[PDB]
């Protein structure tokens, strides 16, 4: 299925993905996309942040949902 | 008579009367007017060290009356004219 | 040496005149919380003398069943005529002597009447807030990298509903787990306790932001305020738990969680599918959302940002098959607001990314608004026109320094339309222009009209 | 005459940590050594990496990759943490 | 006349929402008050140095913090260190 990721920018970008497909590979197509690696990549999915090693269906993602990419700004 | 007109109002009441009196707050809210009348009752509340309601509004009610902007003050009396030749016989 | 009214201290000299009043009065605040709108135009703001609706206030008796304006001083003859001295404000409630020419808004009894019967015992166990906390008002030290947490808890401290929620023991009522080492929400009580009220019975008020603290270092030691990290995550990661503790607490096809967090903070995205030739269609998905990512680039205004936002976008990597035009085609996609929350939260996008792999932020001053509307943003129309959606800005955060290193503030708004700025310790009075000339990066918004 | 000494600072510390807690003159004399030399072999290496960098200016940044040079991993990376933190601090006030 | 039913609606509105809001404001500061006899006003400092208190910002590390955990006092600007050294049990 295809779904979309919006960037800082706010343009959308699509990705072939599996329901079953983890957050790294998902990060990792995001990466060969955008050239960002994971570690830099927040993905964003109803109100939570998506976590390495569980599944896009642990989180009921389906087709043509929408995922927001962030960074982080850090304070202390 | 001058029963018509309580009846003319009892007519506006059943119909259009939560439109205009939003659209005001709204206009009066995001202008400033509020938080300026706000402003204006803390200091006079503390010039005065009082909070006697009717002497307090004694002095707010006129000044409050004269910062409507005259863009807001205008819109609204010229919607409430268009709401008006609506319902009257002249 | 302010006074109270000795005319209702004379009514109350009778307690079962007292009693009378008392019923009248939480009778009326019930009626006006459960009327509707033209009803309450033609039954309370109606002269009973000159027949016309808001001549001025019109005020209620509290003796008989008439209704009278200030315009032509017809309560105020109602007052001279049948000697009914007490009137109730049929905008707020508020009861007015006609001798004292004021209202009373200073005896506690009258505020809180619904606890009439059982005063004497609220009298008994619990006592006022003390000055010093009434506000509840009070700095919390940095104990290391924890900016990036109290900025965030500010706006928490001072929101309504969750402290209509803290205040109303839901958590303490119902915890299974009744230890705040281990519930967030306990915790959060007892900070709510430190800074309003007192603990049994110089250090002070800290208790519960250590006990925060601690069950973070549990949960993860990188959030828990050694180092650095984003506020944005910690604000979702925080409410996460907090949804996590309500369904902890519960002893139970819901596909929507029932939760504070879920009837406060969540609305929905409609995202529209639409054919480019036949501009029909379409094909509608609907995403919850928590708060909205705004990008700022060549931008200067709130609006301007939304605006982006919302605006339509055509995607040209998404494989699209027209079968109204039957042709292949770039599908049209747009994002537009299906539900709005009670409390919208927004992010700045106050970065970007550069090709040599670097990030940069955008300092960028982004003007907002005291108020916002959301009408144009609205994708369903009426039977058409999408009416007016105003929130009221209550919360700031504001970050200095860089993407990677940095400092967290907060500026709350309090009654009376006062601005306070909190910075770890220091809580201190700012003027609204100032903070609206702040770099913002964290809005707190609070619904205020629905037209 | 001044003979300096990290006494105080030292002391400073030690009430921030244990307050109810005194130390020796003996094991003040040792911790001074031990930041004398730290200093030298932080400071040598450091102007080493500028050095060794075509560089006429030694920033913080030298300083972080000479910890992540002389110490081992968590060592390295706490101290840098710390390091960094002070920075920000001292920049934003 | 119909410019002057009109004014009359105006005036109706504003007078209705002047004397909620007046009354509103005289109610809640009366309370205020009569509640607390002794009030001051939060601090306000144009310099932007005092707090609501009309204090500057205390001396850190001169603060120190007692842990429960362990037992040890803690400097409080170097607690979440101590609490890594000290939770890793
Ligand atoms: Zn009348
Ligand atoms: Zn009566
Ligand atoms: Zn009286
Ligand atoms: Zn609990
Ligand atoms: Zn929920
Ligand atoms: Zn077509
Ligand atoms: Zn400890």
């Given at each position: 299925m295809q779904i979309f990721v919006k960037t800082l920018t706010g343009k959308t970008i699509t990705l072939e993905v599996e329901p079953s497909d983890t957050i790294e590979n998902v990060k990792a197509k995001i990466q060969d996309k955008e050239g960002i690696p994971p570690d830099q990549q927040r993905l964003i999915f109803a109100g939570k942040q998506l976590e390495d090693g569980r599944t896009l269906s642990d989180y009921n993602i389906q087709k043509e949902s929408t995922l927001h990419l962030v960074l982080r700004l850090r304070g202390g | 008579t001058a029963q018509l007109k309580s009846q003319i109002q009892q007519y506006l009441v059943e119909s259009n009367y939560e439109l205009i009196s939003n659209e005001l707050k709204a206009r009066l809210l995001q202008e400033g007017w509020v938080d300026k009348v706000k402003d204006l009752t803390k200091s006079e509340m503390n010039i005065?060290?009082?909070?006697?309601?009717?002497?307090?509004?004694?002095?707010?009610?006129?000044?409050?009356?004269?910062?409507?902007?005259?863009?807001?003050?205008?819109?609204?009396?010229?919607?409430?004219?268009?709401?008006?030749?609506?319902?009257?016989?002249? | 040496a302010m006074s109270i009214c000795p005319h209702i201290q004379q009514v109350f000299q009778n307690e079962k005149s007292k009693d009378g009043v008392l019923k009248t009065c939480n009778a009326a605040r019930?009626?006006?919380?459960?009327?509707?709108?033209?009803?309450?135009?033609?039954?309370?703001?109606?002269?009973?003398?000159?027949?016309?609706?808001?001549?001025?206030?019109?005020?209620?008796?509290?003796?008989?069943?008439?209704?009278?304006?200030?315009?032509?001083?017809?309560?105020?003859?109602?007052?001279?005529?049948?000697?009914?001295?007490?009137?109730?404000?049929?905008?707020?409630?508020?009861?007015?002597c006609f001798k004292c020419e004021d209202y009373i808004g200073n005896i506690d009894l009258i505020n809180?009447?619904?606890?009439?019967?059982?005063?004497?015992?609220?009298?008994?166990?619990?006592?006022?807030?003390?000055?010093?906390?009434?506000?509840?008002?009070s700095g919390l030290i940095n104990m290391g990298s924890t900016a990036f947490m109290s900025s965030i808890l500010q706006?928490?401290?001072?929101?309504?509903?969750?402290?209509?929620?803290?205040?109303?023991?839901?958590?303490?009522?119902?915890?299974?787990?009744?230890?705040?080492?281990?519930?967030?929400?306990?915790?959060?009580?007892?900070?709510?306790?430190?800074?309003?009220?007192?603990?049994?019975?110089?250090?002070?008020?800290?208790?519960?932001?250590?006990?925060?603290?601690?069950?973070?270092?549990?949960?993860?030691?990188?959030?828990?305020?050694?180092?650095?990290?984003?506020?944005?995550?910690?604000?979702?990661?925080?409410?996460?738990?907090?949804?996590?503790?309500?369904?902890?607490?519960?002893?139970?096809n819901n596909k929507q969680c029932e939760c504070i967090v879920h009837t406060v903070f969540e609305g929905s995205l409609e995202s529209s599918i639409v054919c480019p030739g036949c501009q029909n269609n379409s094909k509608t998905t609907i995403?919850?959302?928590?708060?909205?990512?705004?990008?700022?680039?060549?931008?200067?205004?709130?609006?301007?940002?939304?605006?982006?936002?919302?605006?339509?976008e055509q995607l040209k990597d998404f494989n699209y098959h027209c079968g109204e035009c039957n042709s292949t085609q770039d599908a049209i996609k747009q994002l537009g607001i299906h539900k709005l929350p009670s409390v919208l939260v927004l992010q700045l996008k106050r970065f970007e990314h550069l090709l040599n792999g670097s990030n940069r932020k955008l300092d960028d001053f982004i003007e907002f608004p005291t108020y916002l509307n959301m009408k144009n943003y609205c994708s369903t129309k009426e039977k058409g026109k999408v009416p007016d959606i105003i929130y009221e800005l209550i919360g700031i955060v504001s970050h200095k320094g860089t993407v990677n290193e940095g400092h967290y503030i907060a500026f709350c708004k309090i009654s009376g339309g006062q601005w306070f700025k909190f910075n770890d310790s220091m809580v201190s009075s700012i003027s609204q222009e100032e903070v609206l000339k702040e770099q913002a990066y964290l809005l707190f918004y609070t619904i205020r009209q629905v037209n | 005459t001044r003979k300096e000494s990290y006494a105080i600072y030292v002391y400073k510390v030690l009430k921030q940590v244990h307050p109810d807690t005194g130390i020796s003159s003996k094991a003040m004399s040792i911790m001074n050594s031990f930041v004398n030399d730290v200093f030298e072999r932080i400071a040598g290496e450091a102007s080493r990496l500028a050095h060794?960098?075509?560089?006429?200016?030694?920033?913080?940044?030298?300083?972080?990759?000479?910890?992540?040079?002389?110490?081992?991993?968590?060592?390295?990376?706490?101290?840098?943490?710390?390091?960094?933190?002070?920075?920000?601090?001292?920049?934003?006030? | 006349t119909i410019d002057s039913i009109s004014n009359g609606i105006l005036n109706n509105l504003l007078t209705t929402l002047i004397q909620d809001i007046v009354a509103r404001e005289t109610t809640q500061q009366q309370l205020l008050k009569t509640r607390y006899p002794d009030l001051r006003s939060y601090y306000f400092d144009p310099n932007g140095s005092l707090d609501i208190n009309g204090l500057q910002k205390q001396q850190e590390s001169s603060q120190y913090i007692h842990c429960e955990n362990c037992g040890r006092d803690v400097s409080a600007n170097r607690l979440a260190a101590h609490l890594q050294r000290c939770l890793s049990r």
């Open positions: - | 005065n060290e009082s909070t006697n309601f009717t002497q307090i509004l004694s002095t707010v009610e006129p000044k409050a009356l004269e910062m409507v902007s005259d863009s807001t003050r205008e819109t609204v009396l010229k919607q409430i004219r268009e709401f008006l030749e609506e319902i009257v016989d002249t | 019930y009626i006006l919380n459960h009327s509707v709108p033209k009803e309450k135009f033609l039954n309370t703001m109606k002269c009973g003398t000159c027949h016309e609706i808001n001549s001025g206030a019109t005020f209620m008796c509290l003796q008989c069943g008439f209704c009278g304006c200030w315009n032509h001083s017809h309560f105020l003859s109602h007052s001279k005529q049948i000697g009914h001295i007490f009137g109730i404000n049929s905008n707020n409630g508020l009861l007015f809180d009447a619904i606890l009439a019967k059982y005063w004497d015992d609220v009298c008994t166990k619990t006592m006022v807030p003390s000055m010093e906390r009434r506000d509840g008002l706006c928490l401290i001072h929101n309504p509903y969750f402290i209509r929620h803290s205040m109303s023991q839901i958590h303490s009522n119902n915890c299974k787990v009744r230890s705040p080492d281990k519930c967030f929400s306990c915790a959060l009580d007892k900070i709510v306790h430190e800074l309003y009220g007192a603990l049994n019975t110089s250090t002070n008020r800290q208790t519960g932001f250590i006990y925060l603290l601690t069950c973070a270092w549990k949960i993860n030691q990188n959030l828990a305020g050694y180092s650095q990290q984003d506020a944005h995550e910690f604000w979702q990661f925080i409410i996460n738990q907090i949804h996590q503790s309500y369904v902890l607490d519960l002893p139970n995403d919850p959302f928590l708060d909205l990512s705004l990008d700022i680039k060549d931008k200067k205004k709130l609006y301007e940002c939304l605006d982006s936002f919302h605006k339509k | 060794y960098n075509k560089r006429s200016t030694i920033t913080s940044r030298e300083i972080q990759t000479a910890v992540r040079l002389l110490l081992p991993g968590e060592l390295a990376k706490h101290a840098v943490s710390e390091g960094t933190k002070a920075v920000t601090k001292y920049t934003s006030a | -």
